Every structure is written in C-alpha cells, then in structure tokens.
Subunit: 117 residues, 3 copies
Amino acid sequence: VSADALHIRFPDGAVIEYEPETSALTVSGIKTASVTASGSVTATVPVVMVKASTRVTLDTPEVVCTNRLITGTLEVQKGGTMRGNIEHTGGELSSNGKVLHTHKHPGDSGGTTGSPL
Amino acid sequence: DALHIRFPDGAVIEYEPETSALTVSGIKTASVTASGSVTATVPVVMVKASTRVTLDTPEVVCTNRLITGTLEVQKGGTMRGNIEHTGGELSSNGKVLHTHKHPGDSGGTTGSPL
Amino acid sequence: VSADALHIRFPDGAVIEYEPETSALTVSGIKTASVTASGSVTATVPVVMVKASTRVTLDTPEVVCTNRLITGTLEVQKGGTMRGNIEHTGGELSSNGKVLHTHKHPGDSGGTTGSPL
Ligand SMILES: [Ca+2]
Ligand SMILES: [Cl-]
Ligand SMILES: [Fe+2]
C-alpha cells in the first residue's frame, strides 16, 4: 500500500523506479514498450517531449492540434484545405513552377505584364 | 485484485480492475527510455499540455488527416495534390493570390485574377 | 529490489508485464490509462508508433516538430505562416477560387492576359 519509493531492477539491466525526492517515475533500459487499451490514453502535464531519433508515426485517421502546429519543413502528400490568412515570406511559393510573388503573364496588347504590384 | 502504491510525496500508481483504469498521479516527471520502439494501440490518445508538445525527431508522419488551428512552417516544404484555400488572403512576399494585379503591357494595370 | 520478471494479471483480464528475455514492457486489456504530472512526460526511443483508430488530439498551445512533418492531407482552420521555399505540384493551389498556376487577369486595354509564364 504505502511504499517509501519504488525500485524494480530486471536481469536484462532495465529498471522501473519512482523516486519521491525528485518526484520522478522512470522506466529505462528496455527495448520495447507497448500499451493496448480499448478506451483512451491521456497525459495531463505541461510539457510532453518525444525524442525519437528515427521517426514518430501517428497512424490515425486524424491528428488534431488544437492551437498552433510549428514544423521545420512540411510535406503534404494528397492535398488539403486552408482557411484564414496564410502569410508566406522568405523564399518562393510556387505551383507547377509558377511563383506567386514574381510571376508575369502575356499582356493583352502582345507584350508581357510586370510582376505583381 | 488491484494495484495501489502510494508514495510520501503524494504520488500514486494504481490499476483498478473494477474500472479497468491505470492511473499515475501526483508525480513531477515521467520518462520512458527504450532502445527499440514505444507503441500505443488505443482508439483515443489525448494530450493536455499547457506549455507544449515537442516531437523531436527527423520525421513526424501523420498517416491520414492532420488538422490544426494555425500552422507555422519554418524552412519550407512541398505540397502535392489540390490545396484549396478559402476565407482570407494567401500571400507570398506581400502578393495576394486572389486579389493581386500586375503592371500591364500598355502602361496601366491588369485587373485581379479571373 | 531485483525481480526476475514482472507478470501481474488482474481479474478483468488486464496484464502489466515486463519480460527481460525480450526486454519488453507490455500493458494490455485495460480500458484507460492516464498520467497526470506537474512537470513533463518524456519518451526517448528511436521509433514511436501510435495506432489510434479514433484520433490523436494534442491539446496544447503549441505542437513543435523539430524537422520534417509529413501528412496525407492537411486542414488549417485559422491561418498560418510559412517561410522558405514552398513547392507545390500535382494539382492546383487555389485561393478563393483563383488558381496560382493557371489564372488569367483582365488586361490593361480591356482584353485578357495569358496564364502565368
Ligand atoms: Ca495592354
Ligand atoms: Cl495587360
Ligand atoms: Fe497574376
């Protein structure tokens, strides 16, 4: 029922521990963890950090970020929708090679327009 | 019958089979460190994080839909398929897709896009 | 303490187990898991796989992906910012019906421009 701490060490070098001095739960030295649940998995904590040197895959019909999503680079594979003001700066925004901020068109008198005003 | 371990800092680790609920509460940090993989297989994953969720990895892959309130892309990207913007402006370096115009070829200006 | 393994089975059929032979932590047969913590929850492992048939919700002011983010489809609800080169192909990029790579304009003499060069 009441325990001073928790330290469980396994013969493969893994540990499961709870240290009340630092208030830290640690599971370390394992090869795999798997959790299978019928309902939900929830974390309520200010910071979640996932440090994955290969990949994080979210295999789900929908990932929802309730506020801002920031990424280094973006790859969209199969299209999508955007609403609200989308502000691009600092490079080109090109579609089929046509650059929004610099493109020109043949004009209606046989010349060429300037780039966008 | 059920797991209930209480610590002097107020932390609790519990499994209650009468609700089938695993609960860890009252702790400051949790961490799981593994050499292979961590997998969760469950219909709903819910993270309530008042500061931030950081995915520090070479690639995050969302297999289907990704929905966000706002988006910030820092170092460019690629998009394939039809991308349909509505409801405000899509601008690049100040030039707005749906309303921009150009100097015309006779010294006036074009209209906006058709 | 040292333990040779961990195999805890409960009467609902749930199992919490650590098997040192394969260094595998497995939790199964539960309905919900919840962690509440005042500081952080961190996972450090090369590969994370989340198989969530309903949805993954990240309810936070900010989700940060440090490098690449890849998705099948994208839905931005309330705007955004982009920097760097954004290269679109394999369809149209349209805003309020106006398509970057094919749009024309009325010309300055009353005709119509060509599409973008
Ligand atoms: Ca003209
Ligand atoms: Cl013109
Ligand atoms: Fe144009």
